[PDB]
Design a protein around this ligand. Sequence first.
Ligand SMILES: Nc1ncnc2c1ncn2[C@@H]1O[C@H](COP(=O)(O)O)[C@@H](OP(=O)(O)O)[C@H]1O
Ligand SMILES: CC(C)NC[C@@H]1CCc2cc(CO)c([N+](=O)[O-])cc2N1
Length: 251
Amino acid sequence: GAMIESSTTIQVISAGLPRTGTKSLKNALEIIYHKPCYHMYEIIFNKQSDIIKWQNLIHDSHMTTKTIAIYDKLKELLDGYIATTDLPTCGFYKDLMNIYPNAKVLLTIRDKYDWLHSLRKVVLPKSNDPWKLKIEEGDKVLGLNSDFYKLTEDSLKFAFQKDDLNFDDDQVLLECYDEYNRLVQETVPSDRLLVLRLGDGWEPLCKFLNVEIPNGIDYPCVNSHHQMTQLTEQLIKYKSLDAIIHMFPDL
Ligand SMILES: Nc1ncnc2c1ncn2[C@@H]1O[C@H](COP(=O)(O)O)[C@@H](OP(=O)(O)O)[C@H]1O
Ligand SMILES: CC(C)NC[C@@H]1CCc2cc(CO)c([N+](=O)[O-])cc2N1
Protein backbone atom coordinates (compact mmCIF):
# COMPACT_ATOMS: atom_id res chain seq x y z
CA GLY A 1 0.00 0.00 0.00
CA ALA A 2 1.02 3.64 0.34
CA MET A 3 3.98 5.03 2.24
CA ILE A 4 2.87 7.15 5.19
CA GLU A 5 5.00 9.28 7.48
CA SER A 6 5.18 7.52 10.83
CA SER A 7 5.70 9.32 14.13
CA THR A 8 8.99 8.65 15.96
CA THR A 9 7.64 7.71 19.40
CA ILE A 10 6.72 4.48 21.22
CA GLN A 11 4.05 2.79 19.06
CA VAL A 12 4.38 -0.76 20.39
CA ILE A 13 4.91 -1.93 24.00
CA SER A 14 6.06 -5.57 24.25
CA ALA A 15 5.42 -7.12 27.65
CA GLY A 16 6.92 -10.51 26.77
CA LEU A 17 9.65 -11.91 29.01
CA PRO A 18 13.21 -12.65 27.85
CA ARG A 19 13.70 -15.85 25.76
CA THR A 20 10.21 -15.57 24.20
CA GLY A 21 11.32 -14.19 20.83
CA THR A 22 11.90 -10.57 21.86
CA LYS A 23 14.98 -10.13 19.66
CA SER A 24 13.20 -11.42 16.51
CA LEU A 25 10.32 -9.09 17.37
CA LYS A 26 12.80 -6.21 17.87
CA ASN A 27 14.22 -6.93 14.41
CA ALA A 28 10.75 -7.27 12.89
CA LEU A 29 9.58 -3.94 14.30
CA GLU A 30 12.72 -2.23 13.01
CA ILE A 31 12.02 -3.72 9.59
CA ILE A 32 8.49 -2.33 9.71
CA TYR A 33 9.13 1.15 11.16
CA HIS A 34 12.73 1.82 10.03
CA LYS A 35 13.53 3.25 13.47
CA PRO A 36 15.14 1.62 16.53
CA CYS A 37 13.45 -0.71 18.98
CA TYR A 38 14.63 -0.93 22.62
CA HIS A 39 15.95 -4.31 23.82
CA MET A 40 18.60 -5.54 26.27
CA TYR A 41 20.83 -5.75 23.16
CA GLU A 42 20.47 -1.99 22.84
CA ILE A 43 21.84 -1.55 26.35
CA ILE A 44 24.67 -4.06 25.93
CA PHE A 45 25.90 -2.96 22.52
CA ASN A 46 24.98 0.74 22.37
CA LYS A 47 23.96 2.32 25.65
CA GLN A 48 25.87 0.72 28.53
CA SER A 49 25.62 4.14 30.14
CA ASP A 50 21.88 3.42 30.50
CA ILE A 51 22.48 0.57 32.94
CA ILE A 52 22.74 2.77 36.05
CA LYS A 53 19.72 4.87 34.95
CA TRP A 54 17.49 1.79 34.74
CA GLN A 55 18.88 0.60 38.05
CA ASN A 56 18.06 4.03 39.54
CA LEU A 57 14.59 3.89 37.96
CA ILE A 58 13.84 0.47 39.37
CA HIS A 59 15.23 1.54 42.73
CA ASP A 60 12.82 4.49 42.77
CA SER A 61 9.88 2.64 41.19
CA HIS A 62 8.56 0.95 44.30
CA MET A 63 6.80 4.30 44.80
CA THR A 64 1.28 11.50 42.13
CA THR A 65 4.41 13.71 42.00
CA LYS A 66 6.96 10.91 42.50
CA THR A 67 5.34 9.01 39.61
CA ILE A 68 5.72 11.86 37.11
CA ALA A 69 9.41 12.00 37.99
CA ILE A 70 9.60 8.28 37.20
CA TYR A 71 7.53 8.68 34.05
CA ASP A 72 9.77 11.50 32.84
CA LYS A 73 12.86 9.30 33.27
CA LEU A 74 11.11 6.51 31.35
CA LYS A 75 10.37 8.98 28.54
CA GLU A 76 13.99 10.19 28.49
CA LEU A 77 15.46 6.70 28.25
CA LEU A 78 13.13 5.79 25.37
CA ASP A 79 13.60 8.95 23.31
CA GLY A 80 14.10 8.22 19.62
CA TYR A 81 12.76 4.62 19.86
CA ILE A 82 9.55 3.36 18.25
CA ALA A 83 9.03 0.30 20.45
CA THR A 84 10.13 -1.56 23.60
CA THR A 85 10.92 -5.25 24.13
CA ASP A 86 12.60 -7.42 26.78
CA LEU A 87 14.12 -6.54 30.18
CA PRO A 88 14.39 -4.09 31.73
CA THR A 89 11.37 -2.49 30.03
CA CYS A 90 8.83 -5.33 29.98
CA GLY A 91 8.12 -5.00 33.72
CA PHE A 92 7.09 -1.36 33.21
CA TYR A 93 4.33 -2.19 30.67
CA LYS A 94 1.50 -0.68 32.72
CA ASP A 95 3.34 2.61 33.17
CA LEU A 96 4.42 2.68 29.55
CA MET A 97 0.73 2.36 28.68
CA ASN A 98 -0.04 5.58 30.61
CA ILE A 99 2.93 7.43 29.17
CA TYR A 100 2.10 6.40 25.58
CA PRO A 101 -1.70 6.10 25.51
CA ASN A 102 -1.76 5.50 21.73
CA ALA A 103 0.73 2.62 21.86
CA LYS A 104 -0.45 -0.95 21.32
CA VAL A 105 0.71 -3.81 23.58
CA LEU A 106 2.23 -7.18 22.64
CA LEU A 107 2.74 -10.31 24.69
CA THR A 108 5.18 -12.92 23.43
CA ILE A 109 4.70 -16.36 24.99
CA ARG A 110 5.90 -19.96 24.63
CA ASP A 111 5.89 -23.40 26.30
CA LYS A 112 7.04 -22.75 29.88
CA TYR A 113 9.56 -25.58 30.06
CA ASP A 114 11.18 -24.48 26.78
CA TRP A 115 11.34 -20.96 28.21
CA LEU A 116 13.05 -22.11 31.42
CA HIS A 117 15.62 -24.21 29.55
CA SER A 118 16.46 -21.25 27.30
CA LEU A 119 16.69 -18.89 30.26
CA ARG A 120 19.21 -21.25 31.96
CA LYS A 121 21.53 -21.30 28.94
CA VAL A 122 21.65 -17.56 28.39
CA VAL A 123 20.19 -15.35 31.08
CA LEU A 124 20.07 -17.12 34.40
CA PRO A 125 22.17 -20.29 34.69
CA LYS A 126 22.19 -22.10 38.05
CA SER A 127 25.10 -20.83 40.19
CA ASN A 128 26.60 -24.36 40.30
CA ASP A 129 26.47 -24.76 36.51
CA PRO A 130 29.99 -24.71 35.02
CA TRP A 131 28.57 -22.79 32.03
CA LYS A 132 27.91 -19.76 34.27
CA LEU A 133 31.68 -19.23 34.46
CA LYS A 134 31.85 -19.11 30.64
CA ILE A 135 28.97 -16.65 30.46
CA GLU A 136 30.80 -14.41 32.94
CA GLU A 137 34.11 -14.63 31.09
CA GLY A 138 32.38 -13.72 27.82
CA ASP A 139 30.41 -10.87 29.40
CA LYS A 140 33.67 -9.30 30.67
CA VAL A 141 34.89 -9.16 27.07
CA LEU A 142 31.78 -7.08 26.27
CA GLY A 143 32.54 -4.75 29.18
CA LEU A 144 29.68 -5.98 31.39
CA ASN A 145 30.32 -6.13 35.14
CA SER A 146 28.32 -7.05 38.25
CA ASP A 147 26.13 -3.96 37.73
CA PHE A 148 24.74 -5.54 34.56
CA TYR A 149 23.86 -8.77 36.39
CA LYS A 150 22.26 -6.70 39.16
CA LEU A 151 20.09 -4.90 36.57
CA THR A 152 18.94 -8.25 35.13
CA GLU A 153 17.98 -9.63 38.56
CA ASP A 154 16.30 -6.46 39.81
CA SER A 155 14.35 -6.01 36.59
CA LEU A 156 13.22 -9.67 36.69
CA LYS A 157 12.14 -9.22 40.32
CA PHE A 158 10.34 -6.03 39.29
CA ALA A 159 8.49 -7.72 36.44
CA PHE A 160 7.54 -10.61 38.73
CA GLN A 161 6.73 -8.21 41.60
CA LYS A 162 8.87 -10.13 44.11
CA ASP A 163 10.98 -8.43 46.77
CA ASP A 164 13.35 -11.37 46.50
CA LEU A 165 13.55 -14.49 44.45
CA ASN A 166 15.37 -17.80 44.59
CA PHE A 167 16.88 -17.67 41.08
CA ASP A 168 18.20 -21.24 41.48
CA ASP A 169 14.69 -22.65 41.96
CA ASP A 170 13.03 -23.80 38.72
CA GLN A 171 9.57 -24.18 40.30
CA VAL A 172 9.60 -20.60 41.50
CA LEU A 173 10.49 -19.27 38.03
CA LEU A 174 7.93 -21.43 36.20
CA GLU A 175 5.14 -20.20 38.44
CA CYS A 176 6.31 -16.57 38.10
CA TYR A 177 6.29 -17.02 34.32
CA ASP A 178 2.73 -18.34 34.23
CA GLU A 179 1.49 -15.67 36.63
CA TYR A 180 3.18 -12.83 34.75
CA ASN A 181 1.68 -13.79 31.39
CA ARG A 182 -1.67 -14.35 32.98
CA LEU A 183 -1.59 -10.97 34.71
CA VAL A 184 -0.76 -9.16 31.46
CA GLN A 185 -3.78 -10.66 29.69
CA GLU A 186 -5.99 -9.59 32.57
CA THR A 187 -4.63 -6.05 32.79
CA VAL A 188 -4.45 -4.96 29.15
CA PRO A 189 -7.73 -4.41 27.25
CA SER A 190 -8.09 -7.12 24.58
CA ASP A 191 -8.63 -4.28 22.11
CA ARG A 192 -5.13 -3.10 22.94
CA LEU A 193 -3.40 -6.49 23.29
CA LEU A 194 -1.99 -9.06 20.86
CA VAL A 195 -0.64 -12.34 22.19
CA LEU A 196 2.09 -13.75 19.95
CA ARG A 197 3.06 -17.39 20.22
CA LEU A 198 6.58 -18.18 19.05
CA GLY A 199 6.40 -19.13 15.39
CA ASP A 200 3.36 -16.99 14.56
CA GLY A 201 5.29 -14.81 12.09
CA TRP A 202 4.36 -11.60 10.26
CA GLU A 203 0.63 -12.02 9.61
CA PRO A 204 -1.05 -11.45 12.96
CA LEU A 205 1.48 -8.73 13.85
CA CYS A 206 1.12 -6.71 10.68
CA LYS A 207 -2.68 -6.95 10.87
CA PHE A 208 -2.60 -5.58 14.47
CA LEU A 209 -0.43 -2.67 13.34
CA ASN A 210 -2.21 -1.95 10.04
CA VAL A 211 0.97 -2.31 7.97
CA GLU A 212 1.80 -4.39 4.87
CA ILE A 213 3.93 -7.49 5.25
CA PRO A 214 7.52 -6.56 4.33
CA ASN A 215 8.12 -7.65 0.75
CA GLY A 216 10.08 -10.89 0.48
CA ILE A 217 11.65 -10.62 3.94
CA ASP A 218 11.11 -13.67 6.18
CA TYR A 219 10.07 -13.15 9.80
CA PRO A 220 13.28 -13.03 11.89
CA CYS A 221 14.51 -16.13 13.70
CA VAL A 222 17.52 -15.09 15.81
CA ASN A 223 18.99 -15.27 19.32
CA SER A 224 18.69 -19.02 19.94
CA HIS A 225 20.62 -20.38 22.90
CA HIS A 226 22.78 -22.36 20.44
CA GLN A 227 23.80 -19.14 18.72
CA MET A 228 24.43 -17.50 22.11
CA THR A 229 26.63 -20.44 23.13
CA GLN A 230 28.61 -19.96 19.91
CA LEU A 231 28.94 -16.21 20.63
CA THR A 232 30.11 -16.80 24.19
CA GLU A 233 32.77 -19.27 22.99
CA GLN A 234 33.98 -16.92 20.26
CA LEU A 235 34.16 -13.99 22.71
CA ILE A 236 36.31 -16.03 25.09
CA LYS A 237 38.52 -17.16 22.18
CA TYR A 238 39.23 -13.80 20.48
CA LYS A 239 38.83 -11.53 23.55
CA SER A 240 36.80 -8.88 21.70
CA LEU A 241 33.43 -8.21 20.07
CA ASP A 242 34.82 -6.33 17.08
CA ALA A 243 37.02 -9.28 16.08
CA ILE A 244 34.01 -11.57 15.67
CA ILE A 245 31.08 -9.21 15.03
CA HIS A 246 31.09 -9.89 11.29
CA MET A 247 30.20 -13.51 12.04
CA PHE A 248 26.95 -12.62 13.79
CA PRO A 249 25.25 -10.44 11.16
CA ASP A 250 22.23 -9.87 13.44
CA LEU A 251 24.09 -7.50 15.82
N1 LIG B 1 10.87 -16.97 14.49
C1 LIG B 1 11.10 -17.86 15.55
N2 LIG B 1 10.54 -19.07 15.57
C2 LIG B 1 10.75 -19.93 16.56
N3 LIG B 1 11.53 -19.61 17.60
C3 LIG B 1 12.15 -18.41 17.67
C4 LIG B 1 11.95 -17.49 16.63
N4 LIG B 1 12.66 -16.37 16.93
C5 LIG B 1 13.28 -16.57 18.09
N5 LIG B 1 12.98 -17.79 18.55
C6 LIG B 1 13.44 -18.33 19.76
O1 LIG B 1 13.23 -17.31 20.76
C7 LIG B 1 14.28 -17.47 21.74
C8 LIG B 1 14.99 -16.16 21.93
O2 LIG B 1 14.10 -15.27 22.62
P1 LIG B 1 14.63 -13.85 23.12
O3 LIG B 1 15.14 -13.11 21.92
O4 LIG B 1 13.46 -13.18 23.82
O5 LIG B 1 15.79 -14.03 24.07
C9 LIG B 1 15.16 -18.58 21.24
O6 LIG B 1 14.74 -19.80 21.84
P2 LIG B 1 15.78 -20.99 22.20
O7 LIG B 1 16.86 -20.48 23.15
O8 LIG B 1 14.98 -22.08 22.83
O9 LIG B 1 16.43 -21.45 20.93
C10 LIG B 1 14.90 -18.61 19.79
O10 LIG B 1 15.14 -19.91 19.30
C1 LIG C 1 28.07 -14.35 27.30
C2 LIG C 1 27.25 -13.37 26.43
C3 LIG C 1 26.69 -14.11 25.20
N1 LIG C 1 26.16 -12.74 27.19
C4 LIG C 1 25.39 -11.85 26.31
C5 LIG C 1 23.89 -12.18 26.38
C6 LIG C 1 23.12 -11.40 25.33
C7 LIG C 1 21.65 -11.80 25.42
C8 LIG C 1 21.15 -11.50 26.69
C9 LIG C 1 19.81 -11.15 26.83
C10 LIG C 1 19.27 -10.84 28.08
C11 LIG C 1 17.92 -10.50 28.14
O1 LIG C 1 17.41 -10.37 26.81
C12 LIG C 1 20.13 -10.88 29.19
N2 LIG C 1 19.70 -10.60 30.43
O2 LIG C 1 18.60 -9.55 30.71
O3 LIG C 1 20.38 -11.23 31.45
C13 LIG C 1 21.46 -11.24 29.06
C14 LIG C 1 21.98 -11.55 27.81
N3 LIG C 1 23.34 -11.89 27.71
